A and B are shown apart, each in its own frame.
Chain A
């Protein structure tokens, strides 16, 4: 549904392989290391190391799409799921949200020292800080959502 199309359902955060059909290594790289891979046998596969256009060298723009996709699932289809399912969706979203913020905040200090000799140009800072503030908006929503359940 105009998404990664690898997760079986937001109710059970699983992906039954078949993610290598996508072309972007970023999509494949992330889907293998925070979701259980289903099946009862090990899965071995890969891509052809000839993919052009590079890999964009960043993770944050990718798993940020997980945050919006997971949060909207609760706000649309979260009432039918059980208590264990409700906690799993929110807890997973918080874990991925803070990782991006940690990377962005660490970039902020190392750049705030650099911007002093760059003619106080905050154009790059504004784009990054807005995303950091946008994550903090999701940070408040996630914790508040779980506090209502408990």
Chain B
């Protein structure tokens, strides 16, 4: 035999059919795609490689030979041929089947020459082998003259791989071409790898075929020609090369199914997604899961080499905070930023061929699946249409016949297609919903199927045909469309200059009735860039000398780029242009050699090309019009996913695209413009709510419905010029405490736009020529409405952003006022005009009490209708306003110049001063709920107050000392007992140091003139006589106790001589007393029967002691007499003073001075009892002693009382025990009493070194005092030893005799200054808890929550007060409670549980109820309309059940303020614009110099709410005054003056505008009832007496402004002021119901004060220095005038001062 190898070389790609079982080889899936490469599957491993059977090659060679012989009239260089048979046969698709392979096209004919028969077949018949007569013969052992073998991949004969590893599956559809919707689709496989391209096989010729040399030469010549003319095989473009003619397993057809190979490391990605979801639900941030699932793909695009994820917003001065998403803790890894990087590094190390892009893609898919599994309702899902795949094939029933027309010319055309608009080619696999299709190496792909479909669509439009191709019919379809597409060959193309990943675009669907998004309306898609170059190749083989006119027309249309190529043509995508067109013609009848030299240019590039004309054509069915719109305000459009990766940290950032021919480009997406046009048309024609299923209305005709297509294409609008951005800041201000609720700083980067410097938008709109007139008129009206300024561009339109046609300076200002009416007069408001007094200082702010009735409505006016008078008449228009300042205004900017003291400039838009609309919106809204008694739109309902426990107060404190149990259930807690402890002392040494610690100063003495001073006090002469020994003693004392004791001993002690004093005293009458038996019943000796017998003679007054004794001896009988004697101990006996008693006392050798005091204590009335006389004598002695001590020495040191030499001090100071301390297990300590055993609480812990019982140990610091003095200088150190004596008077706890503050010597630590002016510390003894046998008690769950809030309160307060970190009192905890923490537990009866946990005995109380329910019960519900369930701990149950859209909102509806201004779900109906100035630079205050403001501090909630039962006072308002002049004068002052203001880090420097400066702005409204419009006009324009308050530094008098209303443009509708006033009055009367108290108070808070003699300041806590210095001080005010109980008053009453001018 002879072997002639063949080579099939593919150029771009080809198609493959999968593997099928033998019994299933005649199904529809196999008959379709019968002309494609097959797939192998072996028994050993079920893997194989593609191959090409020889029958395809034989058919292609036969077709090429037929064409060649027809073209040459049956003579190809001496190869005379005859037509053959081409009929009969018994061909079968498969051997084990009956499918039968038959022709469907027409065979070509040529005249017959020479003789051809069985003995000497012609070359054509020899190739065909028709004389073999294979009928009825199997031919399995029968030879063949010419045989075609298989074709396999060259260089990969033995390589298995898999179907999913070599090929990819695409779904391709068919388009109706009448309505641009799909009808049928099927599945394909494609191979684009460069390795699997070359295929090599062979042709085997037996000896019979090689009859002689001439026959073989002719056969080789014909085969070579046919191989030259072969063009396409297996669905791809190829060229065949014929070599020199010189030479010499099982498919596993059993039952087995296997698919879904998935991918490597899929389980790892699923586990990662699960972990991330678990972390997100742990921190309850599941509302950002889809945002993260798109952010991971953004990271895929954003590369890892220069990645820097954002951070917090830099709270306080310069310290960044933690990002809300990037700083999520995951499995003890605080930083998700580092966790993601570490995970990627581990994945890269573990697996090969792993990069950033693949990891991000897999992670994104995993997170998308996890989000769809867990967080439902996050996306929209009915898809009935777009199904039913269809495949059809039908064997012909008749003979197709023969033809006589064939090709004679071939054309090749080159060119380039460049995308001038972003494109989209959808990629969908039956088994990240939509993605742009691309090659496996990253190159973007433009498939040939799309190109052929577009070409046939355009040629069908040109020819005006209605072909659908009807899938498989009984006969070829014919008609010019198919007759010309039967001879056009188009190559597959790939992008040459782009390989980067594409971008992502998002779309939403709004809810017309509410103006916001739907429940799950959110879609995403991948979008290619603009500027991608795609090669173009065309091949036409037909029998004509010129191109068909339809093709030239289509090329003319393509050269102008007037048609769309990609999928989403509705929003202007897929526009391409054709450039550099060239062509060449070949004549196959006479120039065969020149063609065969290059094989048509698919083997060697063509040398010489000819230029084509393609003049022009204007027949295309689309019309282009240009649109230009100028925007006169800053423009913002949110890109939430991009803002999470930009290192700038901005909250909201604009959308940008890319351009390949050139940098970021700012634009508004064409989807937004299409939505605006559709909404405008629907609102104008009231078609926004009609059902659109088989509707054919204007809206369903311009833009189409679900079952049809649209007639309009909207291109993107690109900003022209060099735009620049700016940082704009925002915050939410609470209405109870004016000031930011929390860190809600919001940032954005809008493109700056000004009426003088507008922003220009340019774009294109394409409309079909078949659109009827009415649709065009509606489009024109919508365009005019948009250009007039009825629809803002982008978001934040209610704050003045993106306004069209906004020139507020065209009007000639607003002189005076029009449409003016008085609400106070018509509502007979007293207003309490009153009169102000100069001699008082008033508060800078007051509180306005809440109302009683809140009028809510379930159904507010909708947005989908321009005007529907269902209940009332609705208006829409604009109001012209003007603003001027009565006092300097401060509006700080976002940029500062400085590092320590940040100076600020005025707000401006690139050098043009202006006022943002947010400030005006806020102040107008606040005045609105002030008037209409609406809800509190901003309110911190989620906050619990703390307060502080007073040391003493009917029990002041009832907390027990306890310790946490072991590592059991955390509920259990065991009580304990407390004793003293070491580790906090001053010094340990011998008694000499202790006795030398004193004698610093302040030694008391005695001097002679004290006697002279006493002599002027009418003191007794005996007192002076006894003091003379004290005068001549020449002794210096140091303690009060020893001096008093010595005085008593030397002068004479009454207690020393009590016995004879009592004996000599006269004894009188005896009377019974109930107190006697009350305080004598302690002893059990006296029986109760004896007590009753004695009580029987109640109130019996006897003459003397003898009568009482006789009665006691007589009445009581038959019992022991010892109790009778004991009863006499507590009898009331009168005491009388007589001369004889005094004489007897004097004769007892007692000091004469005692008798002198006795005589001076003469009293005629008899004493109630001897104890009363003794108490009176003691009181007189104390008074005399105090009077004597008042005239003591004048050292001026306040001689201390005896404290230091006490044994307690010595035993506390000697025992240091700084070391030898252990913090685990039971301790080993003993109670070291000071040789005195009286009761408990007097002991210590000696820590080894009685019964020796000890356990546990504690370690913490104590309080730091505040006192300014110099004791021992020194500096802070870790030695924590005391160095100091004396200072301040310690308040005594309880009293032995009398409770009063008294000076004492106390140790102290050196001040931290080494305002750093008054620091100290007092701690002397520490505490330890010993174990006791107490049953464990369960702990309530709320206790730990209270503890966490308490710990956060300490951290925040310590950071606020700037206390040293080293000596922070109380060691707390990082989180939760540990089994072994030592805390003080509080126990009540209750249910035998513990409700609250505290770290020490004196701490913060922490409340039990939230602020949300502290509004008084006698006031209507003032909580926000949009409520939060978290007031209880049941939000988790709702989240698990998912019923969250029902429990929200007030059950009655929306308050008037929330209706007019809008809520989160509704949309506001009033818009506030930017206020500009007629001149670019208005005059500035202080000659343009910066003003150094004083320190501004945060409002303190715990001033109007002292106790636990306090209720919310109301809204906070600021009064008007003239305190700005003092602030200005204090600034601009020389530094040496102590009255100047220092430039600290906590201060701030700003700029202010002078008075009488005018600004102009406009307010735009829509769908307003007339009463709302009247109330809005009244709020904007108050009475001339009052004024507004705006800007910063309100408490200092800054920012008094007045707004004047000039005109109302209500449009064509008629409006009158009388109706507005009447409606406003009716609404106010309906709301307030003739209630004026709150209204009078509000109008008193808004009164304007111009007088310079009225001073308002703050109490300036505490008063120092001598003299009076005002009643200033928050404590001193609370002591006498305000008081905690009455403080819920004098603050709700406006204009009330606290103190007078000194």
Q: Which residues of A line the B interface, CB within 8 A?
A: 20, 25-26, 28-29, 32-33, 39-49, 54-57, 59, 84, 91, 95
Can you pick out 5 interface pairs between chain A and chain B where the beta carbons lie within 8 Å of each other?
A29-B1442, A32-B1446, A42-B1465, A44-B858, A46-B1447
| A44 and B1446 form a contact (CB under 8 A) | no
Decide: A25 and B693 in contact? CB cutoff 8 A: no
Expressed in whole angstroms, the Cα–Cα distance for A47 and B377 within the complex equals 21
Q: What 0/1 readout, one digit per residue, does chain B (847-888) give for beta carbons within 8 Å of chain A? A: 000000000001111101100101000000000000000000
B1272 CB within 8 Å of chain A: no
**Which residues in B have their C-beta under 8 angstroms from that of A25?**
1441, 1443, 1446-1447
**Is B519 part of the contact surface with A, judged by Cβ < 8 Å?**
yes
Given contacts A33-B519, A49-B1429, A54-B1437, contact A43 B859 (CB under 8 A): yes
User: Counting CB contacts under 8 A, is B1350 at the interface?
Assistant: no
Query: Which residues of the partner chain A approach B865 to less than 8 Å between Cβ atoms?
Result: 40
* Contact among A33, A42, A43, A49 with B1447 in the assembled complex (CB-CB below 8 Å): A49
- A40 near B862 with CB under 8 A, answer yes
CB-contact partner of B858 in A26, A45, A57, under 8 A: A45
Supposing A28-B1446, A46-B1447, A46-B1449 touch, asked if A39 and B859 sit within 8 A by C-beta, the answer is yes
B1434 within 8 A of A: yes
* Known interface pairs A46-B1447, A59-B1442; 18 further A-B residue pairs with C-beta atoms within 8 A, sorted by A's residue number: A20-B1451, A29-B1442, A29-B1443, A29-B1446, A32-B1445, A40-B862, A40-B864, A40-B868, A41-B862, A41-B870, A42-B513, A42-B859, A44-B858, A45-B1449, A45-B1452, A49-B1432, A54-B1441, A91-B382
B1440 within 8 A of A: yes
- CA–CA, A28 to B1444, complex, Å? 11
Q: Which residues of A contact B1431 (CB under 8 A)?
A: 49
CA distance A91 to B1431 in the complex (A): 42
**Interface pair B513/A41, CB less than 8 Å apart:** yes
Within the complex, the shortest CB–CB distance from B1461 to chain A, in Å, comes to: 15
- Answer whether residue B1007 sits at the interface, using C-beta atoms and an 8 A cutoff: no
Interface presence of B901 (CB below 8 A): no
Tell which of B1441, B1446, B1450 has the most Cβ of chain A within 10 Å: B1446
The count of A-to-B residue pairs whose CB atoms sit within 8 angstroms is: 88
CA distance A46 to B1448 in the complex (A): 6
Quick check: is B689 within 8 A (CB to CB) of the other chain? yes
**Contact surface of B with A, Cβ cutoff 8 Å:** 377, 382, 384, 513-514, 519, 689, 693, 858-862, 864-865, 868, 870, 1425, 1427, 1429, 1431-1432, 1434, 1437-1438, 1440-1443, 1445-1454, 1465-1466
Contact of A42 among B860, B1438, B1445 (CB under 8 A): B860
**Which residues of B lie under 8 Å from residue A44 when comparing CB positions?**
858-860, 1425, 1449, 1453-1454, 1465-1466
Q: Is the CB of B1451 within 8 A of A49?
A: no
With contacts A46-B1449, A54-B1441 known, is A41 near B689, CB below 8 A? no
Shortest beta-carbon distance from A13 to chain B in Å: 12
B1440 contact set on A, CB distance < 8 A? 57
A70: shortest Cβ distance to chain B, in Å? Answer: 16
Q: What are the residues of chain A within 8 A of B1446 when measuring CB–CB?
A: 20, 25, 28-29, 32, 46-47
B858: chain A residues within 8 A (beta carbon): 43-45
Chain B residues positioned under 8 Å from A33 (CB to CB): 377, 519, 1445
B1444, chain A: closest CB distance, angstroms: 9
Contact status A95-B382, CB under 8 Å: yes
Q: A29-B1443, A54-B1437 are in contact. Are A40 and B1432 (CB under 8 A)?
A: no
Tell me, rounded to whole Å, the shortest Cβ–Cβ distance linking A71 to chain B: 19
A55 touches B1445 (CB 8 A): no
Instruction: List 6 A-B pairs, minimum CB-CB distance, nearest first.
Output: A55-B1441, A46-B1449, A41-B859, A25-B1443, A29-B1443, A41-B862
Q: How far is the CB of A33 from chain B (nearest CB, A)?
A: 6
> How far is A27 from B865 in the complex, measured between Cα atoms in Å?
31
Bound-state Cα–Cα, A40 to B865, Å: 9
CB neighbours of A95 from chain B (8 A): 382
CB distance from A34 to the nearest CB of B (A): 10
B381 nearest CB neighbor, chain A only: A95
Contacts of B1434 in A (CB 8 A): 49
Q: Which residues of B contact A56 (CB under 8 A)?
A: 1441
In the complex, A27 Cα to B575 Cα: how many Å?
51
Verify B859–A46 contact, CB threshold 8 A: no
A40 to chain B, nearest CB (A): 6
B384 and A41 contact, CB distance less than 8 A: no
Residues from chain B with Cβ under 8 Å of A84 in the complex: 693
B870: chain A residues within 8 A (beta carbon): 40-41
Contacts of A45 in B (CB 8 A): 858, 1449, 1451-1453
The CA-CA distance from A25 to B1441 in the complex, in Å, is 10
In the assembled complex, which residues on chain B have CB atoms less than 8 Å from the CB atom of A49? Answer: 1427, 1429, 1431-1432, 1434, 1438, 1447
Residues of chain B lying within 8 A (CB to CB) of residue A46: 1427, 1446-1451
A26 to B1448, CA, bound (A): 14
Query: Are A29 and B1445 closer than 8 Å at their CB atoms?
Result: yes
- CB-defined contacts of B689 to chain A, threshold 8 Å: 40
Bound Cα distance A46, B1425 (Å) = 10
| Known A46-B1448, A46-B1449, A91-B384; contact A41-B861, beta-carbon cutoff 8 A | yes
Tell me the bound Cα distance from A46 to B1428 in angstroms: 12
The minimal Cβ–Cβ distance linking A47 to chain B, given in whole angstroms, is 6
Collect the chain A residues with CB atoms within 8 Å of residue B1438's CB. 49, 55
In Å, the complex CA distance between A91 and B861 comes to 33
> How many Å lie between the Cα of A44 and that of B1429 in the bound state?
17
User: B800: shortest Cβ distance to chain A, in Å?
Assistant: 25
Q: How far is the CA of A59 from the CA of B1434 in the complex (A)?
A: 19
Tell me the nearest residue of chain A to B1438, going by C-beta: A55
- Write out the residue numbers on chain A whose beta carbons fall within 8 Å of the beta carbon of B1443: 25-26, 28-29, 55
Closest B residue to A28 by CB, please name it. Answer: B1446
Please measure, in the bound complex, the distance between the C-alpha atom of A100 and the C-alpha atom of B858, giving whole angstroms. 33
CB closest chain-B residue, reference A25:
B1443
**Do A42 and B514 form a contact, CB below 8 Å, given A29-B1446, A47-B1447, A55-B1437?**
yes
Residues of A within 8 A of B384 (CB): 91
* Chain B residue nearest to A31 in the complex (CB): B1446
Chain A residue at smallest Cβ distance from B1431: A49
Q: What residues on A are CB-neighbors of B1437 within 8 Å?
A: 54-55, 57
Q: Chain B residues near A28 (CB, 8 Å)?
A: 1443, 1446
Residues of B close to A41: CB separation below 8 A: 513, 859-862, 870
The complex places the Cα of A39 from the Cα of B1448 at a distance, in Å, of: 21
Q: Among B689, B860, B1429, B1447, which residue has the most Cβ atoms of chain A within 10 A?
A: B1447
Alpha-carbon separation in the docked complex, A39 to B1466 (Å): 16
A48 and B519 CA atoms in complex are apart in Å by 22
A15 to B544, CA, bound (A): 69
Q: Give the CA-CA distance A88 to B862 in the complex, in Å.
A: 27
Residues of A near B519 (CB, < 8 A) are 33
Interface centre among B377, B865, B1432, B1449, by most chain A C-beta atoms within 10 angstroms, is B1449
**How far is it, in angstroms, between the C-alpha of A48 and the C-alpha of B1446 when the chains are bound?**
10
Question: What is the distance, in angstroms, from B497's C-beta to the closest C-beta of chain A?
Answer: 46
The distance in angstroms between the C-alpha atoms of A57 and B1438, with both chains bound, is 8
User: How far, in Å, is A12 (CB) from chain B's closest CB?
Assistant: 10
Measured in the bound complex, the distance between the Cα atoms of B1449 and A40 in whole Å is 20
- Chain B, residue nearest A88 (CB): B693
- Specify the chain B residue showing the minimal Cβ separation from A20: B1451
Q: Chain B's nearest CB lies how many Å from the CB of A38?
A: 11
Shortest CB-to-CB span from B695 to chain A, Å, is: 12
A42: B residues at CB distance < 8 A: 513-514, 859-860, 862, 1465-1466
- Chain A: minimal CB distance from B868 (Å): 7
Kindly provide the distance from the CB of A109 to the nearest chain B CB, expressed in whole angstroms: 13
Residue of A nearest to B693 (CB): A84
Nearest B residue (CB) for A40: B862
Docked pose: A42 CA to B1213 CA in angstroms: 78
Q: In the complex, what distance in Å separates the CA atom of A13 from the CA atom of B1452?
A: 26
Q: Closest approach, in angstroms, between the C-beta of B13 and any C-beta of chain A?
A: 38
Task: Give complex CA distance A26, B1444 in Å.
Answer: 11
Residue among A40, A43, A44 having the largest count of chain B Cβ atoms under 10 Å: A44
Q: Chain A residue with minimal CB distance to B1437?
A: A54
Question: Quick one: closest A residue to B1428, CB to CB?
Answer: A49
